[PDB]
Enzyme design. Sequence first.
Site, short mmCIF file in Angstrom:
data_model
loop_
_atom_site.label_atom_id
_atom_site.label_comp_id
_atom_site.label_asym_id
_atom_site.label_seq_id
_atom_site.Cartn_x
_atom_site.Cartn_y
_atom_site.Cartn_z
N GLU A 195 26.59 14.21 4.84
CA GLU A 195 26.10 14.42 5.88
C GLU A 195 25.65 16.00 6.18
O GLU A 195 24.74 16.49 6.58
CB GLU A 195 26.89 13.82 7.10
N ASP A 199 0.87 -1.38 -0.01
CA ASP A 199 -0.03 -0.02 -0.06
C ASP A 199 0.68 1.26 0.24
O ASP A 199 0.10 2.37 0.12
CB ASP A 199 -0.97 0.13 1.24
N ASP A 255 44.07 -5.85 7.80
CA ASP A 255 43.21 -4.79 7.15
C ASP A 255 43.59 -4.24 5.88
O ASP A 255 43.65 -3.33 5.42
CB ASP A 255 42.88 -3.73 8.18
N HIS A 259 32.46 4.71 -2.50
CA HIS A 259 33.65 3.77 -3.34
C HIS A 259 33.09 3.41 -4.56
O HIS A 259 34.13 3.20 -5.22
CB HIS A 259 33.25 2.41 -2.37
N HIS A 290 41.82 1.10 7.17
CA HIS A 290 40.56 1.65 7.67
C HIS A 290 41.28 2.30 8.95
O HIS A 290 40.71 3.06 9.72
CB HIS A 290 39.32 0.95 8.38
N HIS A 348 29.26 6.77 2.38
CA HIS A 348 30.64 6.43 2.30
C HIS A 348 30.68 5.20 1.28
O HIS A 348 31.50 4.92 0.53
CB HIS A 348 31.03 5.69 3.73
N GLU A 349 29.48 4.43 1.34
CA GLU A 349 29.43 3.13 0.40
C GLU A 349 29.31 3.60 -1.15
O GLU A 349 29.96 3.17 -1.93
CB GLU A 349 28.20 2.10 0.67
N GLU A 401 28.19 7.45 13.74
CA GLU A 401 27.61 7.97 15.06
C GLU A 401 26.37 7.30 15.10
O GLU A 401 25.66 6.97 16.19
CB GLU A 401 27.76 9.40 15.41
N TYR A 435 42.57 -1.40 -3.32
CA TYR A 435 42.22 -1.54 -1.90
C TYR A 435 43.35 -2.30 -1.26
O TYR A 435 43.32 -3.02 -0.13
CB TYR A 435 40.96 -2.25 -1.92
N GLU A 460 39.68 4.54 1.38
CA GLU A 460 38.77 4.82 2.67
C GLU A 460 38.33 6.16 3.20
O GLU A 460 37.36 6.61 3.35
CB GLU A 460 39.32 3.91 3.92
C1 LIG Z 1 38.84 -4.41 9.36
C2 LIG Z 1 37.64 -3.78 8.38
C3 LIG Z 1 37.67 -4.67 7.28
C4 LIG Z 1 36.60 -4.37 6.16
C5 LIG Z 1 35.44 -3.36 6.51
C6 LIG Z 1 35.82 -2.57 7.82
C7 LIG Z 1 36.62 -3.09 8.55
C8 LIG Z 1 34.96 -1.59 8.52
C9 LIG Z 1 33.99 -2.27 9.52
C10 LIG Z 1 33.22 -1.33 10.41
C11 LIG Z 1 34.03 -0.30 10.69
C12 LIG Z 1 32.37 -1.96 11.34
N1 LIG Z 1 34.10 -1.12 7.32
C13 LIG Z 1 33.63 0.37 7.21
O1 LIG Z 1 34.32 1.23 7.83
C14 LIG Z 1 32.54 0.59 6.06
C15 LIG Z 1 31.47 0.87 7.01
C16 LIG Z 1 31.27 1.96 7.92
C17 LIG Z 1 29.95 1.74 8.98
C18 LIG Z 1 31.29 3.22 7.23
N2 LIG Z 1 32.58 -0.39 5.11
P1 LIG Z 1 33.53 -0.57 3.85
O2 LIG Z 1 32.53 0.10 2.80
O3 LIG Z 1 34.70 0.20 3.96
C19 LIG Z 1 33.54 -2.19 3.74
C20 LIG Z 1 34.63 -2.94 4.50
C21 LIG Z 1 35.18 -4.34 4.09
C22 LIG Z 1 36.21 -4.95 4.91
O4 LIG Z 1 34.70 -2.62 5.80
CA LIG Z 2 26.63 4.89 20.32
CA LIG Z 3 28.71 11.61 10.99
CA LIG Z 4 3.09 -1.27 3.51
CA LIG Z 5 25.72 13.34 12.68
ZN LIG Z 6 35.03 1.59 2.95
#
Ligand SMILES: Cc1cc2c3c(c1)[C@H](CC(C)C)NC(=O)[C@H](CC(C)C)NP(=O)([O-])C[C@H](CC2)O3
Ligand SMILES: [Ca+2]
Ligand SMILES: [Ca+2]
Ligand SMILES: [Ca+2]
Ligand SMILES: [Ca+2]
Ligand SMILES: [Zn+2]
EC number: 3.4.24.27
Length: 316
Positions: free
Chosen positions: A177, A59, A226, A146, A231, A142-143, A190, A157, A166
Site C-alpha cells: 500500500e 470492447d 481461529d 500468503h 488473526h 495480503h492474499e 480500510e 496455519y 498472518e
Molecule cells: C476468523 C477468521 C478466519 C479466516 C479468515 C479471517 C478470519 C479474516 C476474516 C476477515 C477479517 C473478514 N480474513 C483475513 O484477515 C484475510 C482478509 C482480510 C480482508 C485481509 N483473509 P485470509 O487470507 O487471512 C483467509 C482467512 C481464512 C480464515 O480469513
Molecule cells: Ca468503513
Molecule cells: Ca491499509
Molecule cells: Ca466492456
Molecule cells: Ca489506505
Molecule cells: Zn491471511
Amino acid sequence: ITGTSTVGVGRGVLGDQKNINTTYSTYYYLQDNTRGDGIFTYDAKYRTTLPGSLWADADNQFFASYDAPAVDAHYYAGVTYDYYKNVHNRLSYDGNNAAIRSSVHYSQGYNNAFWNGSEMVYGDGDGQTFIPLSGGIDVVAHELTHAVTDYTAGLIYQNESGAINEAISDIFGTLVEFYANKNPDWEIGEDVYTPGISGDSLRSMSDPAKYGDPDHYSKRYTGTQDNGGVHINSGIINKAAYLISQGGTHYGVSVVGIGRDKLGKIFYRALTQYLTPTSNFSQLRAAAVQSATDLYGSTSQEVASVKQAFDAVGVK
Ligand SMILES: Cc1cc2c3c(c1)[C@H](CC(C)C)NC(=O)[C@H](CC(C)C)NP(=O)([O-])C[C@H](CC2)O3
Ligand SMILES: [Ca+2]
Ligand SMILES: [Ca+2]
Ligand SMILES: [Ca+2]
Ligand SMILES: [Ca+2]
Ligand SMILES: [Zn+2]
C-alpha cells in the site's frame, strides 16, 4: 489464451479509472502478458466452483459495475508483482515467475478473500460489512503474500506459526500500500470495510488494541478458535513491525524507528532465509535479529531497534 497484448481501461471498486493489461483474441481478456508467465483474472459468477471463466469483454472497456472487482483484482495483482520484483528481486510468488490467478464474484454476499493453495479468491461482500474485497490494495497484497509465505518459510496455519503467517501478510500488504502510494496507512482493509462508517478498519498495526487484538505477549489468546488465534495474535507481531518502522515507546520501552524500507528488507530476509514451518514468536525474533545483523552489522542501530521492538511487545 494466445493473442495480442493490449491495454484497456476501466473503473475500480472505489470508482477510480485505471488502465489494465489485456489480451486480444476475438474477445479482450483479463490476461496480462507483461508480468512473468502472466496474471489472469476469472469470473466465478457467484458460484464457488473455481476458477471459473477467464474474464472476457467485448470492447476492452470495463466500466460496468459488474466489472469493477475484476479491474481491481487484475490491476492490484500487477502492482503487487511489481513490488516483489522491484524491491526484493523476487519473480512472482514462487520466485520462478509462476502465473498469478484470481477469481472475483465468488459466492453470494461473501465477506472474505483468501488464497486456496493455488490462486486468490475474492468475495463481493454483503455490501454492508464489505464491498468487493479486491478494491483494497492491502487486501490483494495480503492474499498474494500468503502464496509467497507458502512457497518459502511454509509457516503452518495455526498457533504461533500461523499468527506469524498472518502478520507477514498484513505487513507486506501494508508495504505494498505504501509502495503504490494509494493513501497509505498502518490499518488493514480500510478501503472496503463498512462503507457506511468512515475511519474504521479490520485490524490496526499501529494500535492493535483499538479493535481488541493483543499488543503485548502477555495478552496473547490461548484458546482454540481461529486456529489458535492466527488473526488475533498477529496483532503482537504487527505492533512490533510498526514500532521497528516508525518508532515509539510502548509499555515503557522506547524504540527508534528505522523506516519502512529497512523493515521490508529485514522481514523478507527473515522469511526467505531463516523461518521454518513451525517457527514460533521467539524464533521469529532470532530470525529478525540475525537478518538485521546480516544486513547492517551487529553493532548497528537497525539491530538495536529490532531488539527494542520485540522487547516492547514482550517477545523474548
Ligand atoms: C476468523 C477468521 C478466519 C479466516 C479468515 C479471517 C478470519 C479474516 C476474516 C476477515 C477479517 C473478514 N480474513 C483475513 O484477515 C484475510 C482478509 C482480510 C480482508 C485481509 N483473509 P485470509 O487470507 O487471512 C483467509 C482467512 C481464512 C480464515 O480469513
Ligand atoms: Ca468503513
Ligand atoms: Ca491499509
Ligand atoms: Ca466492456
Ligand atoms: Ca489506505
Ligand atoms: Zn491471511
